[PDB]
UniProtKB/Swiss-Prot annotation:
InterPro entries: eIF2G (IPR050543), eIF2g_C (IPR015256), eIF2g_dom_2 (IPR044127), eIF2g_GTP-bd (IPR044128), P-loop_NTPase (IPR027417), Small_GTP-bd (IPR005225), T_Tr_GTP-bd_dom (IPR000795), TIF2_gsu (IPR022424). Gene3D superfamilies: P-loop containing nucleotide triphosphate hydrolases, Translation factors. The keyword Zinc applies. Mg(2+) 2 binds at D18, G43. Keywords: GTP-binding, Hydrolase, Initiation factor, Magnesium, Metal-binding, Nucleotide-binding, Protein biosynthesis, Zinc. This is Translation initiation factor 2 subunit gamma. GTP binds at D18, H19, G20, K21, T22, T23, N148, K149, V150, D151, S183, A184, L185. It comes from Saccharolobus solfataricus (strain ATCC 35092 / DSM 1617 / JCM 11322 / P2). Residues 15-22 are annotated as: G1. SUPFAM superfamilies: EF-Tu/eEF-1alpha/eIF2-gamma C-terminal domain, P-loop containing nucleoside triphosphate hydrolases, Translation proteins. The gene is eif2g. eIF-2 functions in the early steps of protein synthesis by forming a ternary complex with GTP and initiator tRNA.
Length: 414
């Protein structure tokens, strides 16, 4: 048998709308990540999607067919059990141009990524460009480019696009990134992709002695109809542990916390609770480390967590010291052009009194620029952000032609 363990790595899946991201995750894991009503009706990812799979290798078989996602080697002609390598997980991002902020919030959780490029669409499409730029900005450099839908183009066309992709990455940080052709729909060459994941998206070093921090991307009420009047649970909070570790029965707090009234003013009150349970997928654990998206059970009133109420929060230990800031100072840089538009325009300099969008960890916040300098802006936010470390990455977006567009990036200066 294979061990039951948490995923140890988060692999983002990004790219232009309808290029096959969600179908690719299904090809690898068997899971369709779209669970919301609107997602199923529109046939598109809207919230961040998630799926897990074990990875192993049949030591008697040849690569890439030796790579498997289940404990059998029958497919490569061996009766031996495959050696367990690791459990991995996927963050399935929306490629819709209006959902870039959600993509950015997911990118904060990624240890590496797959950029999916449809072989039967002109290259590079706007969000192919935009997601590529975002990965580079955020520092997700462990990248595999997947050439999807090769089932519906000729060898000639696929090779032509292959050359254009290599020329696109030429002279960039991604110059040496592998390109792997697949059909997600017909599950062709998926084994080569799994091999590629093992080779190019290794499990990164973790620091388990840093103060525990989890970035929140989901929260919900797990209570269902037809259940006994006392089997019901406190709120559950879902996210990615980015450093340290959490254990059942630990005293934790949610930051910035709950929006409340205090002395005639809007205020945020840290939410204190205790970990009641830890779950990855369908399995319970006594502790949780970086890698995967974890579900943290709490003793909170489920009305506090329902409907992704706590998205953008962080969780730390109860006694941890973490800045929660209404005003932030950012050492910034601007992109030269707006890459996400069909027509790429120049980026105008930041001006005082502009309303900008700030992506910090899993959080997304609007604020007003109160100050602009050469290297530095100060922003008054519509709600505070938890800044758990010095020099955290922020991505800056501006509303251009009715759409929020990434225009720069920086470090939050504390
Ligand atoms: N022919 C072909 N169609 C595909 C392939 N992968 C995905 N599709 C189709 O592309 C459409 C969008 O796929 P989806 O997973 O929703 O892409 P996403 O929007 O990037 O997440 C669906 O109709 C898929 O069935 C493929 O490898 N070959
Ligand atoms: N920690 C913890 N997580 C849970 C518990 N029950 C469900 N979850 C997690 O909550 C997530 C969604 O639950 P599910 O019943 O599948 O869907 P939902 O209830 O409609 O949101 C899953 O990732 C589960 O692993 C629990 O008792 N404790
Ligand atoms: Mg999708």
């Amino acid at each position: 048998a294979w061990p039951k363990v948490q995923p140890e790595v988060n692999i983002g899946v990004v790219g232009h709308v309808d290029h096959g991201k969600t179908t690719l995750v299904q090809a690898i894991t068997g899971i369709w990540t779209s669970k919301h009503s609107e997602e199923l009706k529109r046939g598109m990812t809207i919230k961040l999607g998630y799926a897990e799979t074990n990875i192993g290798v049949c030591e008697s078989c040849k690569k890439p067919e030796a790579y498997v996602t289940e404990p059998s080697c029958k497919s490569c002609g061996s009766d031996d059990e495959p050696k367990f390598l690791r459990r991995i997980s996927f963050i399935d991002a929306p490629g819709a141009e209006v959902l870039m902020a959600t993509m950015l919030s997911g990118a904060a959780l990624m240890d590496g990524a797959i950029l999916v490029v449809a072989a039967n669409e002109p290259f590079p499409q706007p969000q192919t460009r935009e997601h590529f730029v975002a990965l580079g900005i955020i520092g997700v450099k462990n990248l595999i480019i997947v050439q999807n839908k090769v089932d519906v183009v000729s060898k000639e066309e696929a090779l032509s696009q292959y050359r254009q992709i290599k020329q696109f990455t030429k002279g960039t940080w991604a110059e040496n990134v592998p390109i792997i052709p697949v059909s997600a729909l017909h599950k062709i060459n998926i084994d080569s992709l799994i091999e590629g994941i093992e080779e190019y998206i290794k499990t990164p070093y973790r620091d388990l002695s840093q103060k525990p921090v989890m970035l929140v991307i989901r929260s919900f009420d797990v209570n269902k109809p037809g259940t006994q009047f006392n089997e019901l649970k406190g709120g559950v909070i879902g996210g990615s542990i980015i450093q340290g570790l959490f254990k059942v029965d630990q005293e934790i707090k949610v930051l910035p916390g709950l929006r409340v009234e205090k002395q005639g003013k809007v205020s945020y009150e840290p939410i204190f609770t205790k970990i009641s349970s830890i779950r990855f997928g369908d399995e319970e654990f006594k502790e949780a480390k970086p890698g995967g998206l974890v579900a943290i059970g709490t003793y909170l009133d489920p009305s506090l967590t329902k409907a992704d109420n706590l998205l953008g929060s962080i969780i730390t230990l109860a006694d941890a010291e973490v800045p929660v800031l209404w005003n932030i100072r950012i050492k910034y840089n601007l992109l030269e052009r707006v890459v996400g538009a069909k027509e790429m325009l120049k980026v105008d300099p930041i001006r005082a009194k502009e309303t900008l969008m700030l992506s910090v960890g899993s959080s997304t916040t609007l604020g007003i620029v109160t100050s602009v300098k050469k290297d530095e802006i100060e922003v008054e936010l519509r709600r505070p952000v938890a800044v758990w470390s010095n020099n955290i990455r922020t991505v800056i977006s501006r509303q251009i032609a009715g759409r929020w567009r990434m225009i720069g990036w920086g470090l939050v200066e504390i």
